[PDB]
């Protein structure tokens, strides 16, 4: 028993972390096969960030201007290209520590582990979610750009995120490993709005199932509800709509505990209306929406 | 910015995880040099756990009764010994992936990362604290015994914990890597009391410094306090005594923010007395005591 915010083991991703330097700008790179991926703003200066024309800035740079380093050893950049907001540097050596990998663009509501890195070296690992408004709440400082988000499917690493920036609003924004930003953000020094964020309803329900599994049942009531009446309440408390697909996804947790999904939606309906009266659920005095139903199944069933 | 419960990168510890099997009992082992460490209850059966005489049970077992496995390959146990509550199996091969390591018995109040493992394979990594009553609040299931707790000091892994058991009370209990249990627990199927737990005051203050660093300053008041008046309040709200040594430890956070330690103790004194009125600090609606002042310094300064 016990339920923690747990990250995937970071080992397979640590062997992919290198240091990328262009001029005086030093950030992190992801080394998979003979390609080192990093955020394109590595080619910029302080003045260039205000409104960079990356096409022009990249033309001014040749392969020899990029220093890729995998520990105490240097790699040779023998090619350079721009795929959206990422730099693809073709190195002469292919990562001997490359694991089985994939590049996936994650859906909002889904979670992933971030390996926070500074100067190509890993500092720590933590789990976060892609919020419905395509922002993430990580922990990143100057030097963390190029740090990646990932999921592990047995032995295959699915890279889903690469950190690009923290906006003046404290929002963390980045791209998938094809340089496509999540949400409406751009790699430009300008004020950018994130948009109205919402609660991931299927995730709150998944964490209420984790709490039931872990002995916290105080919130279970002799009340039931319908999907429509529940979604009327969810709308009011700015929660994402609950579909029958989300009910199906919640099925393994419904089977493990014996509590139907609508009976759980009724407990959650009361939790929103009455509050929780100081009381805690899994050691939290608020509703936690950053655990997917899949993260609950994995943690509570011992998936390795 | 951002402040998360962050674990050390688990890579150096994943290369030390093997599967130990004695009879029908399968758990995790830690392979360092030519020694595989695991909890001694691996030699037990369901009937043996009620009141095991481990000296007798171990005599009944010879080296050939232990199956150590490092992935898809098997190792040869050429020696076996009992150091308190751990089994030290001398294998014929020395771990090629052994990193620079140490064995430290951690103080209550300190934190560490746990690499949760099942059948010698890592499932996830999470950070937890050794509570003042020498219990931990991890996330462990059947098959997780032998999973280890650790800290990283640049490149040196300090192993501090090995999971042994979850008591009927949900408490997680285990030993240091010398088989000495933390607290008063024994590896025997009997009801065991943990003792009165207290809040780690220096840790709550460290997390209030992390919140100030991250823009949450609402709780900072035009009030100050003395160590004695603060400890009178801390006693009331079942908080660990605050020493001048804890004030010294908090110094780097005091310097970074400009807020004296006693001014922070006064904000915390009000937080205990008034509550927090639904308001959140770093996304939590309660006081968080599982971040050491050192974890705050490391996360907020980019220590790799
Ligand atoms: C500093 C940091 C912290 C956390 N995560 C990410 C980051 N880094 C960024 O955001 C990179 C970034 C992106 C944009 Cl579009 C502009 C700049 N501009 C120039 C001014 C200099 C700065 F690094 F000090 F910010 C920087
Ligand atoms: C199951 C588990 C879950 C989380 N962390 C740890 C564990 N495992 C334990 O506690 C091991 C343990 C220790 C003690 Cl002293 C007795 C037993 N007895 C026998 C009955 C069988 C059991 F595994 F099903 F519990 C087991």
Curated annotation (Swiss-Prot), chains A, B:
Ranges in the topological domain labelled Cytoplasmic: 1-304
Catalytic activity: TSAVLQ-|-SGFRK-NH2 and SGVTFQ-|-GKFKK the two peptides corresponding to the two self-cleavage sites of the SARS 3C-like proteinase are the two most reactive peptide substrates. The enzyme exhibits a strong preference for substrates containing Gln at P1 position and Leu at P2 position
Effect of mutating residue 205 to V: In strain: Zeta/P.2
Domain of life of the native organism: Viruses
Subcellular location, record wording: Host cytoplasm; Host Golgi apparatus; Host nucleus
Active-site residues (renumbered): 41 (for 3cl-pro activity), 145 (nucleophile)
Glycyl lysine isopeptide (Lys-Gly) (interchain with G-Cter in ubiquitin) crosslink location in chain: 5, 90
Coiled coil: none
Assembly notes: 3CL-PRO exists as monomer and homodimer. Only the homodimer shows catalytic activity. Interacts with host FBXO22; this interaction promotes the proteasomal degradation of nsp5.
Described purpose of this protein according to its UniProt entry: Cleaves the C-terminus of replicase polyprotein at 11 sites. Recognizes substrates containing the core sequence [ILMVF]-Q-|-[SGACN]. Cleaves and inactivates human TRMT1, preventing tRNA guanine(26)-dimethylation of tRNAs. May cleave human NLRP1 in lung epithelial cells, thereby activating the NLRP1 inflammasome pathway. May cleave human GSDMD, triggering alternative GSDME-mediated epithelial cell death upon activation of the NLRP1 inflammasome, which may enhance the release interleukins 1B, 6, 16 and 18. Also able to bind an ADP-ribose-1''-phosphate (ADRP).
Record-given protein name: 3C-like proteinase nsp5
Gene of this entry: rep
């Amino acid at each position: 028993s016990g339920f923690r915010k747990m990250a995937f083991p970071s080992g397979k991703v640590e062997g992919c972390m290198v240091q990328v330097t262009c001029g005086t700008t030093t950030l992190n790179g992801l080394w998979l096969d003979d390609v080192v991926y990093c955020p394109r703003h590595v080619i910029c200066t302080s003045e260039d960030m205000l409104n960079p024309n990356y096409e022009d800035l990249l033309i001014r740079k040749s392969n020899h201007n990029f220093l890729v380093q995998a520990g105490n050893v240097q790699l040779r950049v023998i090619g350079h290209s721009m795929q959206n907001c990422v730099l693809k540097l073709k190195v002469d050596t292919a990562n001997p520590k490359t694991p089985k990998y994939k590049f996936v663009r994650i859906q909002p509501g889904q979670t992933f582990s971030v390996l926070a890195c500074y100067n190509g070296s890993p500092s720590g690992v933590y789990q976060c979610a892609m919020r419905p408004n395509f922002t993430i709440k990580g922990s990143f400082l100057n030097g963390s750009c190029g740090s990646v988000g990932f999921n592990i499917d047995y032995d295959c690493v699915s890279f889903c995120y690469m950190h690009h920036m923290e906006l003046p609003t404290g929002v963390h924004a980045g791209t998938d490993l094809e340089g496509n930003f999540y949400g409406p953000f751009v790699d430009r020094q300008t004020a950018q709005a994130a948009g109205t964020d919402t609660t991931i309803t299927v995730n709150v329900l998944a964490w209420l199932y984790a709490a039931v599994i872990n002995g916290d049942r105080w919130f279970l009531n002799r009340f039931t509800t319908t999907l429509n009446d529940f979604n009327l309440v969810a709308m009011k408390y700015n929660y994402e709509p609950l579909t029958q697909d989300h009910v199906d996804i919640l099925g393994p947790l419904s089977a493990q505990t014996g509590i139907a999904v609508l009976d759980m939606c009724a407990s959650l309906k009361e939790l929103l209306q009455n509050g929780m009266n100081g009381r805690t659920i899994l050691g939290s005095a608020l509703l936690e929406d950053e655990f997917t139903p899949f993260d609950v199944v994995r943690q509570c069933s011992g998936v390795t």
